Each structure stands twice: as C-alpha cells, then as structure tokens.
Design a protein around this ligand. Sequence first.
Ligand SMILES: [Ca+2]
Lengths: 189, 199
Amino acid sequence: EPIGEAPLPRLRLTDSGGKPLAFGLISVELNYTCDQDICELVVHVDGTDDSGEAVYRLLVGINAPNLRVGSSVFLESDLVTVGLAVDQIVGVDQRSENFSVVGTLKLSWHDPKLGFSPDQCGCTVKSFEDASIRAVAGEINLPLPSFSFYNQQGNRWSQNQVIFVTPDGRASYFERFTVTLQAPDFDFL
Amino acid sequence: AYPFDRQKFSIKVDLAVPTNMFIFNEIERFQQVVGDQLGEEEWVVTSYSQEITEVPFERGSTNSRFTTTLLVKRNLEYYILRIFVPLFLIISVSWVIFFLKDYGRQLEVASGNLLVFVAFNFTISGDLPRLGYLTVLDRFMIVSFCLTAIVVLISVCQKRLGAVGKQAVAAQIDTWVLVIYPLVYSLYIIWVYLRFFTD
Ligand SMILES: [Ca+2]
C-alpha cells in the first residue's frame, strides 16, 4: 500500500519462467497456493502505468493469513569482501596512455552450498591451485564470483593463484598480478 | 603534403556467410560514435560516416559489409610555432647582414649563421618522418639551406671586390640582393601551393 499520493500501483505474481500464476485484487492484496513438488514464485511490481518518489511498504508471508521477525522469505545476494594492495609502479606510457602496476588482490565470501564433510576426505580445507575463478566454477558446476579488470590491455601475469574452502562454507581467493591498464584520461598540458 | 595532410581511417566488418542467409539491415546508435576524452590528441576528428554495402564472396554471390570512416587531421599550431616561426628568424638574420658596409665582419657572420641552420635541423629530426620519399616539409628545408649557403659565396666575392679597389660595384650588389632575396621565397611558396594543394 502506498504512503502518500497513491497512484494505484499494479502488482503481479508469476512463475520463475514468467508464466502468470495470480493477479492482484483491489491496498492491493493477492493469495495463491501451489501443490507441485517444486514451486518457485517471482513477485512483480509495476509502476509504468509524473509521480513523486515511491513511498511504499511491501509485506509478504508464508502461511500468514493475518499479516499487517520470523525468517527471511526473499532470496538474498551473497556479500563479498574485497581488498587490493599496490606494491610497485613499473612504468607509464605517455603516447598510448597506459601504465603498468604490480600488486595483490584478495576476495572472500560465504556460501553454504560449498560445504562438505571431513569424513569423506580426512581434511579441513580443499584446494584449487593455478586456476581462475571462472575455470573452477565450471569444474564443480557452482556459481562463483568471477571478476575482471575493466581497462586491461593484453594478458596479465598471475602468480600464486589459489582458492581454499572450509567445511562450513567459507571460501577465499588470493592472487598476485602484473597488469597493464589503459588510462585515456591523462592530461599532459 | 606533410604536415598539412588529411587522412581517412576505415574500419570494415565483413560477414562470413553468403547474403542469402544473413544480411546487414539496420544501423543502431547505442553510443556516441567518436568518444570524448580529457586532454588533447595528436589526431583530431572532423567528420564521420557509416554505410552498408555488398561485396563479392569467395564462394560466389555476395556478402554484406559494414564500414565506418573517420576523417582526421594533424595539429597545425604545433608545427607552425615549433618549426616555421624559428625558421623565419634564422632566415631573416642572413637577409639583414647586407646592410653592413664592411665585409670582413659580414663574411664571418654569414659563415656563422650557416652553422646555426644545420644545428637547428637536429632538434626537429624527430618531427621529420624517415620515409623513402620527399614531402612538402622536406622540400622547403632543402631550398632554405641552398639559399643560406649561397649567401656565404656572395660575401666572399664582395670582399674580393672591395680589396681590389672597386667598392661602388660591391655596394650595388647589396641593393639587388636585398630586393631579390625576399622575392624568391615568396615565389617559391606560391609555386608549392599550386602544385600540391590547388591541383
Ligand atoms: Ca587524454
């Protein structure tokens, strides 16, 4: 329901494949019960049909006819911690406008889908060495936080690449790089 | 026509399938064709165009081609100030020495100024491309050197005339040179403009 300046918003409830499943009823409310073995929902909020801000509060629940803490119902994106350190500046090209840098990059995130059991390995940490995040993700068929350098020119020399995962599900990445980056914003006037 | 030359940069994208399977139909402008970046650039873009045509294929029939052309030109203020302005002052020094009525000092100033002309050629050596053929800039520097070297030859002749005893004849040569010398430079510049620029 809107807070102020109500524009009569339109809401929809479709399947994961876009097939509609339920429609709103005029404080727009709607209900739906699914009986299939696997049942995934997507909530659509449309405002295409000049307005001042949004001022909206959306309430959803499962098996909660009353409504109006509990547990989270919507999917939440993973949170990634990132750090970068610069060790050297190899050179600067003043004609092609690019520079070379040497440094260290570290990533870390938590994902319960990567967990395992120590019984089947007799080990605490898993190892994937000399492989990028993209290559490892294809091997284990799991989504991973692939990254790239935006203004990279040519290939880069990567050293000490490694990923380690713990039984809880915490993973991290480490790499030492030597890269050349294009910088067209140089001004030598 | 260096450094007053204008070039064209052509970027051609060719489909690798015959025109009866896939054909280029429309051009979309999702972004500015030529982006703007901070600072100055060596080559500036004046205009651009995009077009779709058809070209023969190695299989046979035809295939589609997408072409982007950029028209570019150099930075004229760089070459005018760095090369032509210093060259004018060096040349004008050899012209003004003919006002002196002595020739033991005119000869030594004329000889000394030839060395400055050669030394000035070292600084702009980077700005002269090392191609296998003569350009407009190369031709002008050759003419200027020959005229500067001829001044040394005339000065020697005048000194011999004064030592013998004839000074009125040497004084008349000064008047003729002071007029003809600026005329040859003006005539040559017009000749260069007619040959290379206005057809
Ligand atoms: Ca720049």
